[PDB]
Design a protein around this ligand. Structure first.
Ligand SMILES: *[C@@H]1O[C@H](CO)[C@@H](O)[C@H](O)[C@H]1NC(C)=O
Lengths: 85, 450, 204, 85, 51, 51
């Protein structure tokens, strides 16, 4: 099927968030893991970059234990940057 | 000055009636004496409740002290509202505006929600039954929508006890599926104990789980079961035993003989029974305040049939109601005061946590201040995973004659020795099972290797 | 009223009850062995001497949600018929992967409710939720509909599910041309010959 | 400043549409011109591909004279494909 | 477009066809020059079709 | 002398800084260290000098 970078983004944030939910309270540790899982599930134009890189970074620096919900709600609108390199 | 007051004790309620009698004895005065008429019934039965209520009514009681159930509560509220007869209850607070009802039990919602906010719970599971009503459920759902909470609402009351074994196993299986640990138990103490036993049986009382018991009876039940389980458990306490009042009362309570007062010989007391005692206090002080204000509530004639249509209420009732609602007294539940509707105000709910040594109060909850906190509070062998590669890890020629870390030789072996030497730990060299460095499987999405 | 009918020596009683009064009816009819037949919502449990004319909506609703394949939606309820349906869909949400927003519209007084619905649907704008299930009496249904049209959320992209047997009993002409999908349940088929004849007699 | 391909898409369709509105009846002819302008205004990860390629193709194949509104309303949700290639 | 020649008795779908034909052109911006009654009618129909 | 801010400096570390800042999504202002040292710990005062 055809790829949609936008659909890729929305799916990315959703899957990352849904992933981090099982890791509640350890949330700040597993951001990159769940980002990997989300990159696998939602696909990526560049395997290194991932589905949404900017959201990944935002989450990584913002997310604190149990602070997940507010963090995701803040970071999901963030610009993903260039999904090329 | 004999004051006739009706009362309703569900069959099997002992310590409540015991504390009721103790209240009758302690708050008795030479000025006036309460003359209780006790009537035992099936509290879940609406018909029984109606019959008992009209029985007390025709007897011409000036007030009624009793209990109700989710089924029968509307009968009590409607009848007391119609006939203008005051009703005093330890049972759960009604959500709404109900006249002529004095609810001794404090509203637990605020304490619970503030507790959730305190532990910073983004997502949790809420186990409830329909006994005390779904009011709390509505509360936590609306607060969940407002604060963006993901809440799992599960009704544990509709599962039949005869067929419930694998039901709860499947329950906690589905609950373990999502990796959700945090759990709130809002239930009657019996159902609580059942769920607890199922938890220890299924081994869900291990580390990583956090249970919140919502009730005023946190220390009234047995906490010894999950105490050593290793899971954190938190709850609410309406009775502080460190208080001098409660301590002396407890001395008198524990010195009492069990034959005369059933279940009255104990270190503690169920919060319902305490609420009953304090209710006796409230009634005594109410009628005392009525006598000091020089208002005569004495009945001229018999009340007649309660069902008689059109129902006519007595005038005195409103006066007795105001008398009860205006009462402010000190008791086992802390400061006791009521608003215009009859609900509790200015109460204090001690927030407590179960530790290894036992239960302890970590704070208190106020209607205004919300949560306020009270006083703030070898070496294991390190497993080293490694893979065989030259000259990183290799088998010695004589290795069959050796054991453990002496079996392997290589760069990584020596490096391991150095790292363990500097970090000061005992290390066990082991070869990885699958024999891979590390990878993510495109199918199972599972990491393999070291 | 019940004891009045009883003393009159009636052989049966036909009536209605409320979430408050239902226990009185069930307990009294069970105790006095007087048969009670009602159009009002089905009691949850095993109650003798009560014949409930109203069918159970739970299964139909759940099957419909499964049919439209709704992963996440908003559920608007009131305390009038009880939280039974809410409890049901919550339990099924726990079983499935459903994300459900449960909001109580019943405790809101009709006199002062203007901005209550604006703030409600504002909070509904927070989550971006375009799927909504209304479990309510026809009156609250109509009010909520009017409020929906007022803020213009009845346009395309929105999907509403009205839970009741009265889908054609309320006014649907309001949101009919809005371009939003609306689904519901009907217990009376006017296409049936019996109902057609009854309607011919009824309209005269 | 990050580009965020999704915002790039919404902007792309918006600028294409707003441009094509200026040409009445010639709508099917100027699709590529307005797409050029939209790629210019909204920027592109790949100058050749443009802001959203799938939408461009969709419009080119669908749009008929005076049929603009319905055509665009149909084509704006389509997947953009690979934005880097 | 003349909205004045439309009879009130038969006018329901007339406005639906009007704004459908207006959706053809994709026209959002609209100027209403009308009597308060006709203004109110056209407005109500606008709310009905959700434009 | 004719430029200002981050445009004043050029180099490997400048480009790397630009890349890191682009990746982490923050605005960065390049500044030269005061003491002009990389880093050190004085064995007496135990004060760190440098970047
Ligand atoms: C008593 O309750 C009222 C009602 O909320 C409150 O305003 C007041 O502050 C309370 N007093 C104390 C000492 O908590």
């Amino acid at each position: 099927g055809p790829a949609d970078c936008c659909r890729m983004k929305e799916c990315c944030t959703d899957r990352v968030n849904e992933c981090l939910q099982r890791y509640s309270g350890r949330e700040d540790k597993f951001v990159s893991f769940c980002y990997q899982e989300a990159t696998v599930t939602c696909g990526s134009f560049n395997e290194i970059v991932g589905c949404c890189y900017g959201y990944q970074m935002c989450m990584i620096r913002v997310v604190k234990p149990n602070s997940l919900s507010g963090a995701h709600e803040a970071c999901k609108t963030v610009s993903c940057g260039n999904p090329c390199a | 000055n004999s004051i006739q007051i009706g009362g309703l004790f569900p069959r099997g309620a002992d310590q409540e009636y015991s504390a009721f009698r103790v209240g009758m004895v302690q708050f008795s005065t030479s000025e006036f004496r309460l003359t209780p008429h006790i009537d035992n019934l099936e509290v879940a039965n609406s018909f029984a409740v109606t019959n008992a209520f009209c029985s007390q009514f025709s007897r011409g009681v000036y007030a009624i002290f009793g209990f109700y159930d989710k089924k029968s509560v509307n009968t009590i509220t409607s009848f007391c509202g119609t006939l203008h007869v005051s009703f005093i209850t330890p049972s759960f607070p009604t959500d709404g505006t109900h006249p002529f009802v004095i609810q001794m039990r404090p509203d637990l919602k605020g304490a619970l929600l503030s507790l959730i906010e305190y532990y910073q719970w983004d997502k949790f599971a809420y186990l409830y039954d329909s006994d005390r009503g779904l009011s709390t459920l509505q509360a936590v759902l609306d607060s969940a929508a407002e604060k963006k909470w993901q809440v799992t609402a599960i009704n544990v009351g509709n599962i039949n006890n005869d067929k419930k074994d694998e039901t709860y196993r499947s329950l906690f299986q589905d609950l373990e599926l999502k990796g959700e640990r945090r759990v709130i138990l809002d239930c009657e103490r019996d159902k609580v104990n059942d769920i607890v036993d199922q938890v220890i049986t299924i081994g869900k009382h291990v580390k990583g789980y956090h249970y919140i018991i919502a009730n005023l009876g946190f220390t009234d039940g047995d906490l010894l079961k999950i105490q050593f389980g290793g899971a954190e458990v938190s709850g609410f306490q309406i009775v502080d035993y460190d208080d001098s009042l409660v301590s002396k009362f407890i001395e008198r309570w524990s010195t009492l003989e069990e034959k005369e007062y059933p279940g009255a010989h104990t270190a503690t007391i169920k919060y319902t029974s305490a609420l009953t005692y304090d209710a006796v206090q409230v009634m005594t002080e109410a009628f005392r305040n009525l006598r000091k204000q020089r208002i005569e509530i004495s009945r001229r004639g018999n009340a007649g049939d309660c069902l008689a249509n059109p129902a006519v209420p007595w005038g005195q009732g409103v006066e007795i109601e105001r008398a009860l609602k205006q009462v402010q007294v000190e008791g086992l539940s802390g400061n006791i005061k009521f608003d215009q509707n009859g609900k509790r105000i200015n109460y204090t709910i001690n927030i407590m946590e179960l530790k290894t040594n036992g239960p302890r109060k970590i704070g208190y909850w106020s209607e205004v201040d919300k949560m306020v906190v009270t006083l703030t509070e070898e070496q294991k062998t390190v497993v080293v995973t490694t893979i065989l590669e030259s000259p990183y890890v290799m088998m010695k020629k004589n290795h069959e004659m050796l054991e453990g870390n002496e079996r392997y030789e290589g760069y990584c072996v020596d490096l391991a020795a150095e790292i363990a030497k500097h970090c000061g730990f005992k290390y066990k060299l082991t070869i990885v099972g699958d024999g891979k460095y590390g990878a993510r499987d495109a199918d199972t999405k599972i990491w393999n290797g070291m």
